[PDB]
Design a protein around this ligand. Structure first.
Ligand SMILES: */C(S)=N\c1ccc(-c2c3ccc(=O)cc-3oc3cc(O)ccc23)c(C(=O)O)c1
Length: 129
């Protein structure tokens, strides 16, 4: 599913990311924009041989199992395919574990490089929430 911006903002709010770990909703929306362009089905093979899955590009070496990443820990206890669903629940639940891991949203390089410190509230502006 490719979400529009305000549609994803409302889904992420409904799923409890607004202010999760202190990160306002616009941070999550901005991160999803730059990780996946709001496409739940996005997959990308990483240089380390792992693959990133879903709207927040969650990684098969640490977080989900894809059966093809040597060393996998599957700390979210889910198949990586679950992160591609039109239902964002599994992505949200695993993202909540990731952002709790110690470095906050810096676990997403794209958030650090493109969202952190910017006017992230712009990503929610205008939306009925
Ligand atoms: C896309 S645009 N927006 C969108 C579409 C569908 C859902 C969503 C649900 C929304 C509210 C609920 O109470 C329950 C939902 O269950 C869903 C189940 C599946 O399989 C897929 C989508 C569901 C959302 C959303 O989760 O907020 C958003």
């Amino acid at each position: 599913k490719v979400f529009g911006r305000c549609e994803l903002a409302a889904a992420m709010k409904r799923h409890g990311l607004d202010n999760y770990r202190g990160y306002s909703l616009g941070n999550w929306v901005c991160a999803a924009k730059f990780e996946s362009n709001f496409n739940t089905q996005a997959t990308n093979r990483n240089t380390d041989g792992s693959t990133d899955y879903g709207i927040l590009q969650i990684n098969s070496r640490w977080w989900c199992n894809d059966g093809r990443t040597p060393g996998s820990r599957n700390l979210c206890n889910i198949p990586c395919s679950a992160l591609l669903s039109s239902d964002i629940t599994a992505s949200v639940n695993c993202a909540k574990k990731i952002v709790s891991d110690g470095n906050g949203m810096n676990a997403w390089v794209a958030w650090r490089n493109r969202c952190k410190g910017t006017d992230v509230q712009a990503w929610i502006r205008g939306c009925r929430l």
